[PDB]
PDB file of N, H, CA, C and O in Angstrom:
ATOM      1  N   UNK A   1      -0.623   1.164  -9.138  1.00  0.00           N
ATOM      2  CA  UNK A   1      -0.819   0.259  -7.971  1.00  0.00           C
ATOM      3  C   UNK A   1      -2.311   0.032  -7.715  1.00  0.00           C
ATOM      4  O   UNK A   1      -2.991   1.021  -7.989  1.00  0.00           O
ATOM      5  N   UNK A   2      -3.137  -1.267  -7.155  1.00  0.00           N
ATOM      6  H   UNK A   2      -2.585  -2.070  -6.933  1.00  0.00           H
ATOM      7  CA  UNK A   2      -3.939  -1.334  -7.191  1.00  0.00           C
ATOM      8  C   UNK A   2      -4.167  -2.090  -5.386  1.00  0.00           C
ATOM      9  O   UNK A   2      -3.675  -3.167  -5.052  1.00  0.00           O
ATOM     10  N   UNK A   3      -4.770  -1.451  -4.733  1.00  0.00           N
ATOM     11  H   UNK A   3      -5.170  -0.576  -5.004  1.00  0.00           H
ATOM     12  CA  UNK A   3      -5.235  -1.875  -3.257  1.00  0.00           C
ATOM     13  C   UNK A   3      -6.777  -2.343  -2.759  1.00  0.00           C
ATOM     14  O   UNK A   3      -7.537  -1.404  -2.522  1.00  0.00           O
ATOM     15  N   UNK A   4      -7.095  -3.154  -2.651  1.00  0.00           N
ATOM     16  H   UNK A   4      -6.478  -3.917  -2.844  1.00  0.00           H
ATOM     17  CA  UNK A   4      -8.157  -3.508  -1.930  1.00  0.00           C
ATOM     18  C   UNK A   4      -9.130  -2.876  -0.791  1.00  0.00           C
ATOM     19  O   UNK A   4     -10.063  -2.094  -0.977  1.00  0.00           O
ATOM     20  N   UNK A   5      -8.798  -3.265   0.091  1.00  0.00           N
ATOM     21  H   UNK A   5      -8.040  -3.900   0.243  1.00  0.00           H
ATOM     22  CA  UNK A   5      -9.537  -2.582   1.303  1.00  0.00           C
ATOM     23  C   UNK A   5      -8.903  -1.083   1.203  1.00  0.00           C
ATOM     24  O   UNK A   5      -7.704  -0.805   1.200  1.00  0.00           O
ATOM     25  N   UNK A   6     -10.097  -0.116   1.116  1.00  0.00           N
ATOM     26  H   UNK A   6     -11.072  -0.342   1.118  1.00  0.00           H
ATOM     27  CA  UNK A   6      -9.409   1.425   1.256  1.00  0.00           C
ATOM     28  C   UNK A   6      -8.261   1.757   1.684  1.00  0.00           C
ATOM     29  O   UNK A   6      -7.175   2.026   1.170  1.00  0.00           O
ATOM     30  N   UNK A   7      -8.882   1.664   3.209  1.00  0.00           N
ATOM     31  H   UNK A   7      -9.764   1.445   3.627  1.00  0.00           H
ATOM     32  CA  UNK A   7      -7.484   2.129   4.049  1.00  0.00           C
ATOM     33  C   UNK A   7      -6.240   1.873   3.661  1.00  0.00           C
ATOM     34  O   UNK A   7      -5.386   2.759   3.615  1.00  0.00           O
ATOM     35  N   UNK A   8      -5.939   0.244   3.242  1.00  0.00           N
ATOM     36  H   UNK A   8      -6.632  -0.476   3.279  1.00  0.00           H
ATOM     37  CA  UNK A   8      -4.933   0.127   2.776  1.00  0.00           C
ATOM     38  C   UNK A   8      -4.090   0.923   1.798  1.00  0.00           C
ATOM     39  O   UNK A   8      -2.860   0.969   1.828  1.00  0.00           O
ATOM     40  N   UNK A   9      -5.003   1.648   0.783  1.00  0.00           N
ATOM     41  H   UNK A   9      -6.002   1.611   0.759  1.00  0.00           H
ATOM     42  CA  UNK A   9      -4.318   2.263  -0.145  1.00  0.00           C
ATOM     43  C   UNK A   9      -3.927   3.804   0.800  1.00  0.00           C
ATOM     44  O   UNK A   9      -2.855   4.401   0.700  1.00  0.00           O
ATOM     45  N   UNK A  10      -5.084   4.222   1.695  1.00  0.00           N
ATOM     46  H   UNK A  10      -5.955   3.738   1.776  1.00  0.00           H
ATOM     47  CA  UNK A  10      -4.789   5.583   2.633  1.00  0.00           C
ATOM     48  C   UNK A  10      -3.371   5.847   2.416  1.00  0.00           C
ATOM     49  O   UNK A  10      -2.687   6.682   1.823  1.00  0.00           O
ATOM     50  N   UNK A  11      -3.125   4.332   3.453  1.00  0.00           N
ATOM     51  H   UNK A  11      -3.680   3.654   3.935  1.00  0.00           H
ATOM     52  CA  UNK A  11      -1.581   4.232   3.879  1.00  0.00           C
ATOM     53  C   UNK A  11      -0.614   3.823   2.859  1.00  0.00           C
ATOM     54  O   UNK A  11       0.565   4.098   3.080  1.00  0.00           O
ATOM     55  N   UNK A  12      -0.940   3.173   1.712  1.00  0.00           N
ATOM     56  H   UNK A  12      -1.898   2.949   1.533  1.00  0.00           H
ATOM     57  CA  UNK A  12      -0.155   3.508   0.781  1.00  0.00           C
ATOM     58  C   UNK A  12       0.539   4.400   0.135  1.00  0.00           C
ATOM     59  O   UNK A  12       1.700   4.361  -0.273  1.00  0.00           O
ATOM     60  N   UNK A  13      -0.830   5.776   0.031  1.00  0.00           N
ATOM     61  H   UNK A  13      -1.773   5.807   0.362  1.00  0.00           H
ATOM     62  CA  UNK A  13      -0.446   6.906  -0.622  1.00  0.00           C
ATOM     63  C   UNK A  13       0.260   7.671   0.377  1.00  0.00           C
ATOM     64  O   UNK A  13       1.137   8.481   0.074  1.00  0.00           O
ATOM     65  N   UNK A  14      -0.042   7.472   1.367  1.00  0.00           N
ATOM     66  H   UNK A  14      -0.754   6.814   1.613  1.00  0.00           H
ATOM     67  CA  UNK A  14       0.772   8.411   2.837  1.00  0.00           C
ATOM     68  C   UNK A  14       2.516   8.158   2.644  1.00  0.00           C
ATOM     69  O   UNK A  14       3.452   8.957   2.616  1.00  0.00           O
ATOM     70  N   UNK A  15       2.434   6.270   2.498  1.00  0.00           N
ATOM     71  H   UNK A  15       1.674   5.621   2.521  1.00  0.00           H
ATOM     72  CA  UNK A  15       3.768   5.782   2.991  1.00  0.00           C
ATOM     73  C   UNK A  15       5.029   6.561   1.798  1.00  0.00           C
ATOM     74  O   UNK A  15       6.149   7.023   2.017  1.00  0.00           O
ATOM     75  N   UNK A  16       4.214   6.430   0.508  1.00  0.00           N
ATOM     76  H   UNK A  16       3.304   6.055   0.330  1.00  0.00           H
ATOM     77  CA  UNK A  16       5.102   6.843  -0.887  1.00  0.00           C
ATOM     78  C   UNK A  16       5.183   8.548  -0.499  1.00  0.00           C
ATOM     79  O   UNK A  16       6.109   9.221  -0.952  1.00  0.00           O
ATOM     80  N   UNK A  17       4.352   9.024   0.189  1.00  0.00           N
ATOM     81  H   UNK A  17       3.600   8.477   0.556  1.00  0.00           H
ATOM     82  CA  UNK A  17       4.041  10.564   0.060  1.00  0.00           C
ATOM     83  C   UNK A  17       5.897  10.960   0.507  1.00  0.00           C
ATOM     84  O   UNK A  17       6.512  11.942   0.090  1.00  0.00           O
ATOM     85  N   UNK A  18       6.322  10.131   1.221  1.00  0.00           N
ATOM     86  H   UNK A  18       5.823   9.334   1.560  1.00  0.00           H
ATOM     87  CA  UNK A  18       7.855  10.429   2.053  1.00  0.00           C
ATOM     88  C   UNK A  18       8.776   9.764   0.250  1.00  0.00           C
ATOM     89  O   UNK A  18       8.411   9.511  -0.898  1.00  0.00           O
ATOM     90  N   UNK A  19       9.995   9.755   1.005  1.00  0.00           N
ATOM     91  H   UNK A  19      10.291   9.960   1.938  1.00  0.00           H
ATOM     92  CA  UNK A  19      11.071   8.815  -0.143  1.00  0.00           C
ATOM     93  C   UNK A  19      11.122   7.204   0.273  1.00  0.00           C
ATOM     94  O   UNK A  19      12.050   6.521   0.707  1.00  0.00           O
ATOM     95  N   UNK A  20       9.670   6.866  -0.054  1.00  0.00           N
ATOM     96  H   UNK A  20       8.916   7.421  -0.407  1.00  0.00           H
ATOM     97  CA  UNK A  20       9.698   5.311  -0.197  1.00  0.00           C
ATOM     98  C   UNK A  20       9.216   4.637  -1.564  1.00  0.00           C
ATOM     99  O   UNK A  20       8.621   5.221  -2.471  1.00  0.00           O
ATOM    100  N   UNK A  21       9.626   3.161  -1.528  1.00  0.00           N
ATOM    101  H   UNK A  21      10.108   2.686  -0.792  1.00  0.00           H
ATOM    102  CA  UNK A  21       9.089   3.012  -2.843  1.00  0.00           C
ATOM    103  C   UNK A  21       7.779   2.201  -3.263  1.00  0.00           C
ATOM    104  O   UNK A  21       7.568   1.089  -2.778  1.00  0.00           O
ATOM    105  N   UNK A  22       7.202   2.591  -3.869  1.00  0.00           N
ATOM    106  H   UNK A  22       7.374   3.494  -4.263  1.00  0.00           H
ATOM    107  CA  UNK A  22       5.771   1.287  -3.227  1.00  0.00           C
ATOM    108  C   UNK A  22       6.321   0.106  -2.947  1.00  0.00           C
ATOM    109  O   UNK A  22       5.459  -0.382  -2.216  1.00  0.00           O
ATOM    110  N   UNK A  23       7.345  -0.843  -3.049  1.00  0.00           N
ATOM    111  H   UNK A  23       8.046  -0.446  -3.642  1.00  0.00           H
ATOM    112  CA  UNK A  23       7.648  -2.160  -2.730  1.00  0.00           C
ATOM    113  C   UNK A  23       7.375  -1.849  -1.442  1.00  0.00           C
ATOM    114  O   UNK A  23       6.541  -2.629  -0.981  1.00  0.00           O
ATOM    115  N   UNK A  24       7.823  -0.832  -0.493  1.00  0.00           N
ATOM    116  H   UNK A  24       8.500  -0.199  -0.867  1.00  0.00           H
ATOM    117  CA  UNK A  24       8.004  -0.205   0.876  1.00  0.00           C
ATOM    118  C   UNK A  24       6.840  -0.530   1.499  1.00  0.00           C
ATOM    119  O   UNK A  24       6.662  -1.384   2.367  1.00  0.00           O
ATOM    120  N   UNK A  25       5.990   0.281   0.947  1.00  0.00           N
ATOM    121  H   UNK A  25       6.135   0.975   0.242  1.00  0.00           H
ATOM    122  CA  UNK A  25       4.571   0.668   1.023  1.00  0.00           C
ATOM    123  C   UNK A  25       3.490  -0.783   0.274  1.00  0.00           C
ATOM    124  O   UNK A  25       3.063  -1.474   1.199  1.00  0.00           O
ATOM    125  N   UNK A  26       3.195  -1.114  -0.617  1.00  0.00           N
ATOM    126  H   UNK A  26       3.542  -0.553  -1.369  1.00  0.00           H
ATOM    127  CA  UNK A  26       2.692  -1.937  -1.107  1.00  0.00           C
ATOM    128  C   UNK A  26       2.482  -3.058  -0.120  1.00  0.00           C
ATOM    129  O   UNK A  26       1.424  -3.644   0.108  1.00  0.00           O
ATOM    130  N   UNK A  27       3.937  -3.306   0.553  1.00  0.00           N
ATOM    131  H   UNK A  27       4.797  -2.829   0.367  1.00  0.00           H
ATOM    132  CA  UNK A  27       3.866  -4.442   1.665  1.00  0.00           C
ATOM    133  C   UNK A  27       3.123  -3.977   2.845  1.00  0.00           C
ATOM    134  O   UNK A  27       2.043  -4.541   3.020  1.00  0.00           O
ATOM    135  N   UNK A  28       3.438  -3.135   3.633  1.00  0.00           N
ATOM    136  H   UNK A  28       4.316  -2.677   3.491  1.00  0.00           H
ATOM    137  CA  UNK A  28       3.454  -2.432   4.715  1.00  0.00           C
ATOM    138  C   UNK A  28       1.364  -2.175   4.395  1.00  0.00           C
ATOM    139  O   UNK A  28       0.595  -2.356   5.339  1.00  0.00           O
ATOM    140  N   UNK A  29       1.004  -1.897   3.444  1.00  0.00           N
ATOM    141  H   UNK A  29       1.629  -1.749   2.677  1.00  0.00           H
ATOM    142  CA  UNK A  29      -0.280  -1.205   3.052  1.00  0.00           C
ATOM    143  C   UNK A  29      -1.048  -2.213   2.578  1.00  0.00           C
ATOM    144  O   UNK A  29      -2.150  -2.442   3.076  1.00  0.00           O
ATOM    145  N   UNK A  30      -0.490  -3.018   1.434  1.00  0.00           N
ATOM    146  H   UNK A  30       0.406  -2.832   1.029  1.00  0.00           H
ATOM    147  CA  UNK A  30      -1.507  -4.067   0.803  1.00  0.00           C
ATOM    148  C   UNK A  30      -1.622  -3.958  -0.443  1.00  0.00           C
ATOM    149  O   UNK A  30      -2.263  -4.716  -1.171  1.00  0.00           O
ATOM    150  N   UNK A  31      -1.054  -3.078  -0.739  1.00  0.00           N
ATOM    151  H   UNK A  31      -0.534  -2.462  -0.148  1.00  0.00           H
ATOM    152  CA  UNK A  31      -1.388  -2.894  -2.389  1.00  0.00           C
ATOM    153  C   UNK A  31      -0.233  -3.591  -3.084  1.00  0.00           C
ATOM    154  O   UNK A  31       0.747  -4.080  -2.522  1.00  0.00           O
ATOM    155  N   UNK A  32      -0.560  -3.559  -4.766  1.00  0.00           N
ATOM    156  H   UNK A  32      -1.356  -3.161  -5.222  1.00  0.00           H
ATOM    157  CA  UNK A  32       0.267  -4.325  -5.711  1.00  0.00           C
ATOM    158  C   UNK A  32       0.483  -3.770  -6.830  1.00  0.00           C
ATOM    159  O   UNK A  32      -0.298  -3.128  -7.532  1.00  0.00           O
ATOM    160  N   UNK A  33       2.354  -4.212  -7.111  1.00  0.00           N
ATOM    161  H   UNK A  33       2.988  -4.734  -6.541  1.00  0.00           H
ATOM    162  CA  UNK A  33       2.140  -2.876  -8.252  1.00  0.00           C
ATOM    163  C   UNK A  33       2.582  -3.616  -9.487  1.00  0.00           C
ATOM    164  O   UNK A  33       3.463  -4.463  -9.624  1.00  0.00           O
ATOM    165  N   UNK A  34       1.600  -2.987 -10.499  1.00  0.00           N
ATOM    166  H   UNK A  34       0.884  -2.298 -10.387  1.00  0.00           H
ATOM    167  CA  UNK A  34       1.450  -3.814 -12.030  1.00  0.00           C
ATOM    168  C   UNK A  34       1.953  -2.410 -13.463  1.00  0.00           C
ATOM    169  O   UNK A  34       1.154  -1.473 -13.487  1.00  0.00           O
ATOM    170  N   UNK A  35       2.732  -2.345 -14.151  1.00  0.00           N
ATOM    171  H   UNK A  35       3.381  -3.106 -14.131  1.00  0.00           H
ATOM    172  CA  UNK A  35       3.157  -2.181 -14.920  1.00  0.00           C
ATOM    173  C   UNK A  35       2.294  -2.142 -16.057  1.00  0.00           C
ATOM    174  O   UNK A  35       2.573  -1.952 -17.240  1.00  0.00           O
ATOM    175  N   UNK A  36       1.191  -2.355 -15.495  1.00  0.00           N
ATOM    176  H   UNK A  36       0.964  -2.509 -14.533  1.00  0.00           H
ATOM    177  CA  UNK A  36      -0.320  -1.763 -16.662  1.00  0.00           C
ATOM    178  C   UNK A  36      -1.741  -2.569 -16.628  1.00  0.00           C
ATOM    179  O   UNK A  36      -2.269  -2.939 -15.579  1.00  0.00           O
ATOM    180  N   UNK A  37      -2.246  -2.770 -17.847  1.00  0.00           N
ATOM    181  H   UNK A  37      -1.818  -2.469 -18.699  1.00  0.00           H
ATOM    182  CA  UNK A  37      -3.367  -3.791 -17.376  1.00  0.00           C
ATOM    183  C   UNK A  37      -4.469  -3.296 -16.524  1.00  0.00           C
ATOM    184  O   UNK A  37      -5.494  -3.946 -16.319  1.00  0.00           O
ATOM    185  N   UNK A  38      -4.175  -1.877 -15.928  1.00  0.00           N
ATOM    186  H   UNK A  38      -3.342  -1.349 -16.094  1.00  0.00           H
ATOM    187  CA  UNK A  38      -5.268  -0.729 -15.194  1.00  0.00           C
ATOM    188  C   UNK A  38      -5.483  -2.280 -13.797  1.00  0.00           C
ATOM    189  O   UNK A  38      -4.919  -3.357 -13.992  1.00  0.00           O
ATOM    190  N   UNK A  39      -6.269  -2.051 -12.667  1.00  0.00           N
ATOM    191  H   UNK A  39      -6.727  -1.177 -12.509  1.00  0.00           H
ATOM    192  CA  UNK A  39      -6.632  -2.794 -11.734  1.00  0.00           C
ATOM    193  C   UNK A  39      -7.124  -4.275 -11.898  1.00  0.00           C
ATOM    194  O   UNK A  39      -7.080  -4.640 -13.073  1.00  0.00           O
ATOM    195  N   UNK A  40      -7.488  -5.026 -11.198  1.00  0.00           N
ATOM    196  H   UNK A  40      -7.523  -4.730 -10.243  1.00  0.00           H
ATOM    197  CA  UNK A  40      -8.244  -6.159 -11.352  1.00  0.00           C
ATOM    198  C   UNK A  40      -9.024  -5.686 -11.383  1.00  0.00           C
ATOM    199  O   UNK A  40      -9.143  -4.493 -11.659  1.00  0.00           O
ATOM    200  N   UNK A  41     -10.169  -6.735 -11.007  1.00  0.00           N
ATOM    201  H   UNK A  41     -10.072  -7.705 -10.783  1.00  0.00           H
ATOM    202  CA  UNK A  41     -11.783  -6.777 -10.836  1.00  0.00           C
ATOM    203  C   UNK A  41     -12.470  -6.533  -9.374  1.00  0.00           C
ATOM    204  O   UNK A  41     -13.465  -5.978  -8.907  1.00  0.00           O
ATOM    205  N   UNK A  42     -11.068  -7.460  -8.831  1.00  0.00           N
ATOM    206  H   UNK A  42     -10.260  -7.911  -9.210  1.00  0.00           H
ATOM    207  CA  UNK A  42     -11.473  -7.074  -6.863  1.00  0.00           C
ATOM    208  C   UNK A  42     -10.550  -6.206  -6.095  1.00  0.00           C
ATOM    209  O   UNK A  42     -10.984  -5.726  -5.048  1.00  0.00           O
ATOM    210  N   UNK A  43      -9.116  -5.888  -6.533  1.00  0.00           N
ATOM    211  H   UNK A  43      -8.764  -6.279  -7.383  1.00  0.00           H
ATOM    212  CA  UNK A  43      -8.552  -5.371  -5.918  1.00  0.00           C
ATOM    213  C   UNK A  43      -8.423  -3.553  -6.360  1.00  0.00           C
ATOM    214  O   UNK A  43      -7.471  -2.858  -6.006  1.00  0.00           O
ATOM    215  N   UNK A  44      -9.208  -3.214  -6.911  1.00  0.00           N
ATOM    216  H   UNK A  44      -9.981  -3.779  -7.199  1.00  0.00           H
ATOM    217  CA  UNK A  44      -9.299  -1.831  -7.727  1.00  0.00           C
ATOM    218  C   UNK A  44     -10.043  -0.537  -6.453  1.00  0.00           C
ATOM    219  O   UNK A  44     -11.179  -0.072  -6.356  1.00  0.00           O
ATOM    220  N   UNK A  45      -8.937  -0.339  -5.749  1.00  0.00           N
ATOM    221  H   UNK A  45      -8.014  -0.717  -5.827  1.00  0.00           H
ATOM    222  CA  UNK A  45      -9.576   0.686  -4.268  1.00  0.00           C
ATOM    223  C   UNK A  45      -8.103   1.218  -3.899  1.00  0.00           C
ATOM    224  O   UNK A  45      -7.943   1.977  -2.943  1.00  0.00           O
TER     225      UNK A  45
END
């Protein structure tokens, strides 16, 4: 998964830390989840 603004990912890693799934979290947080390809260029936080 790759998140932008910090925090966003904070709460990403918090939201998955329970039984959610990043779709859960990803929305809720900001982040995006890619199946490889390592981060972009701007969204890599």
């Amino acid at each position: 998964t790759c998140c932008p603004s910090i925090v966003a990912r904070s709460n990403f890693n918090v939201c998955r830390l329970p039984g959610t799934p990043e779709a859960l979290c990803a929305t809720y947080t900001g982040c995006i989840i890619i199946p490889g390809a390592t981060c972009p260029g701007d969204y890599a936080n």
